[PDB]
């Protein structure tokens, strides 16, 4: 069936939302809220504190951790609610009844929680401070949170490299504040994630 494959190519890899610039003045609103559901285990050694146990065993080890199914980096979780597998509970009860696998004391269950995901897409606007200086790239400081890489050939000839070296704006004064650049691709190369930056491409 030739009609299935075109949509399965273009729609499933197509993302959910696009970030607009606030009044064309600030930056994008790439910090977005999304409700998720998952299915995780729970240790008996934190059974007295089961919600914070689930937090410290699946969610607090998910802090600043990238997933492509969420598309970005989580800046914190909110609203942990366990979907109890026992009916007639009405979401106001304390005797939640989680299913136990018949080999281990780590009980798996469903949980809804919100995520605050940072995800950039193709053709977006971000900004960065002065973080490092080099001869052909400057890794920009993304929201004082991440690092941005710049390939050399995307730099026009109007930029003035001086010489350790430094980049000089077309205004001629040394740069300061938050420099604007365009997102082309997202990468995970390094200890944390990075981004592919551009200015004319």
């Amino acid at each position: 069936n030739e009609n299935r494959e075109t949509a399965r190519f273009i729609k499933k890899h197509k993302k959910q939302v696009t970030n607009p610039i606030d009044e064309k003045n600030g930056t994008s609103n790439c910090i977005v809220r999304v409700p998720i559901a998952l299915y995780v285990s729970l240790a008996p050694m934190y059974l007295e504190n089961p919600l914070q146990g689930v937090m410290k065993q699946h969610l607090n080890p998910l802090v600043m951790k990238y997933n492509n199914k969420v598309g970005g980096v989580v800046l914190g979780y909110e609203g942990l609610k366990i979907l109890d597998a026992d009916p007639l509970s009405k979401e106001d009860t304390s005797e939640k009844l989680i299913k136990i696998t018949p080999d281990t004391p780590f009980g798996f269950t469903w949980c809804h929680v919100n995520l605050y995901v940072w995800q950039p897409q193709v053709g977006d606007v971000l900004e960065g401070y002065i973080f490092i200086q080099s001869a052909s790239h400057i890794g920009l400081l993304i929201h004082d949170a991440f690092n941005a890489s710049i390939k050399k050939n995307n730099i026009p000839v109007d930029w003035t490299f001086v010489h350790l070296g430094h980049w000089v704006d077309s205004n001629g004064e040394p740069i300061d504040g938050k420099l604007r650049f365009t997102v082309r691709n997202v990468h995970t190369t390094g200890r944390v994630v990075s981004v592919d930056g551009t200015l004319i491409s």
Partner: protein, 104 residues
């Protein structure tokens, strides 16, 4: 404990979107990040790739380095290893198997 757990108890990589345990494999850990198991049945070739756009999530390379795309819905189940043997032996007669794996 006896007839399964003490003889040939094994994990298994499954792609849930195809529902098989054999065609999945390990990707070559390239210079960017750690390796990740992937699905050869749910794989997009670089030959055509409906180009008569792919985001940098599912591009991975085999041992010679050909670019495949797909097969991320991966989970590990508990099987005997002789089940993997029987899966590889039933295809010799031309039989597909399909294993429903919840949580879907």
């Amino acid at each position: 404990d006896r007839l399964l757990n003490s003889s040939d108890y094994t994990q298994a990589s499954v792609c849930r979107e195809c529902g098989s345990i054999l065609t999945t494999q390990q990707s070559v850990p390239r210079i960017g990040s750690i390796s990740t198991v992937c699905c050869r049945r749910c794989s997009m070739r670089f030959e055509d790739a409906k180009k008569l756009f792919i985001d940098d999530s599912q591009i991975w390379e085999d041992g010679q380095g050909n670019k495949f795309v797909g097969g991320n819905e991966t989970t590990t189940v508990a099987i005997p290893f002789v089940l993997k043997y029987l899966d590889s032996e039933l295809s010799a007669m031309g039989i597909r198997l399909r294993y429903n794996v919840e949580p879907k």
